[PDB]
Amino acid sequence: NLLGEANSFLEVLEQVSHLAPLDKPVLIIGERGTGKELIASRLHYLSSRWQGPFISLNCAALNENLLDSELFGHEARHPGRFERADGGTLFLDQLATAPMMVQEKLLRVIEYGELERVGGSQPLQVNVRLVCATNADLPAMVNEGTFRADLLDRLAFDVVQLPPLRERESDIMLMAEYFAIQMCREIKLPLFPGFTERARETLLNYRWPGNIRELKNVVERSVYRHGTSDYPLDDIIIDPFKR
Numbered sequence: 199n200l201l202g203e204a205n206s207f208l209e210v211l212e213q214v215s216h217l218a219p220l221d222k223p224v225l226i227i228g229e230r231g232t233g234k235e236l237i238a239s240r241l242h243y244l245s246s247r248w249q250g251p252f253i254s255l256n257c258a259a260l261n262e263n264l265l266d267s268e269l270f271g272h273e274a275r276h277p278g279r280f281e282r283a284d285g286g287t288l289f290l291d292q293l294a295t296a297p298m299m300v301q302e303k304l305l306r307v308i309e310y311g312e313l314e315r316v317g318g319s320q321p322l323q324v325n326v327r328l329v330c331a332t333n334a335d336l337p338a339m340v341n342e343g344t345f346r347a348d349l350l351d352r353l354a355f356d357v358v359q360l361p362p363l364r365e366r367e368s369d370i371m372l373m374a375e376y377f378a379i380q381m382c383r384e385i386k387l388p389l390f391p392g393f394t395e396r397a398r399e400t401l402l403n404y405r406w407p408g409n410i411r412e413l414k415n416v417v418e419r420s421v422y423r424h425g426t427s428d429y430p431l432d433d434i435i436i437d438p439f440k441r
């Protein structure tokens with residue numbers, strides 16, 4: 199799924215088309231629900247590595263010891279995500295939550311191209327194209343001492359900045375209409391009856407902290423609650439916890 203014709207979004211797609219063929223690491227900056235893993239996927243499938251594996255790992259999800267083992271692997275065997283991504287692309291989400299230990303080890307892999315291993319096993323050479331994502335201000339975290347300056351000096355070969363939905367105002371009604379129509383098909387309404395001006399005001403004035411994921415859920419819920427093709431959708435249900 200890839201909607202949007204806001205110039206800011208089209209510029210991202212152009213940038214991605216040029217970055218994909220490189221073996222260089224790419225940093226994606228963007229809020230939740232803006233499509234970051236989908237962009238990472240595009241970088242993979244437009245690259246020369248497209249027939250190789252596309253592996254993903256969310257850094258925020260795992261505790262420090264588990265993240266270490268999941269990313270770099272362990273034995274006394276559990277192949278880590280770098281190993282699984284050999285010949286392909288590894289996507290690291292919520293990068294700024296990585297503990298400083300993992301950050302240092304990550305830089306080592308990037309700069310030396312091998313996974314450390316003792317206990318008898320020879321080191322593992324890996325060939326992986328890295329894509330990372332975050333919505334943190336990484337330069338600010340470097341100043342705070344919570345992100346490694348040397349990792350950022352190396353990792354940010356270039357940066358893809360995904361615009362939030364609220365800065366893609368023209369895409370809001372375009373996407374809302376698309377999601378509404380899909381929901382009409384799912385609940386077997388003959389036609390999407392349109393959005394009233396009140397509904398449009400509600401959609402366009404909301405700041406969409408959850409961006410596209412949130413827009414889809416809000417619109418689907420609103421269409422379902424409306425439940426008819428006989429007149430236009432007027433009530434946009436942003437918050438389902440209200441009664």
Ligand SMILES: Nc1ncnc2c1ncn2[C@@H]1O[C@H](COP(=O)(O)OP(=O)(O)OP(=O)(O)O)[C@@H](O)[C@H]1O
Pocket residue numbers: 199200201202228229230231232233234235236237410411
């Ligand atoms: N260009 C797009 N066109 C249509 N839908 C999109 C687009 N980008 C994202 N979405 C929708 O938004 C939802 C979330 O996408 P995605 O997980 O890639 O965002 P994200 O930035 O990775 O969010 P998070 O970081 O919270 O996981 C998906 O269900 C997807 O359908």
Ligand SMILES: [Mg+2]
Pocket residue numbers: 234235291
């Ligand atoms: Mg994601």
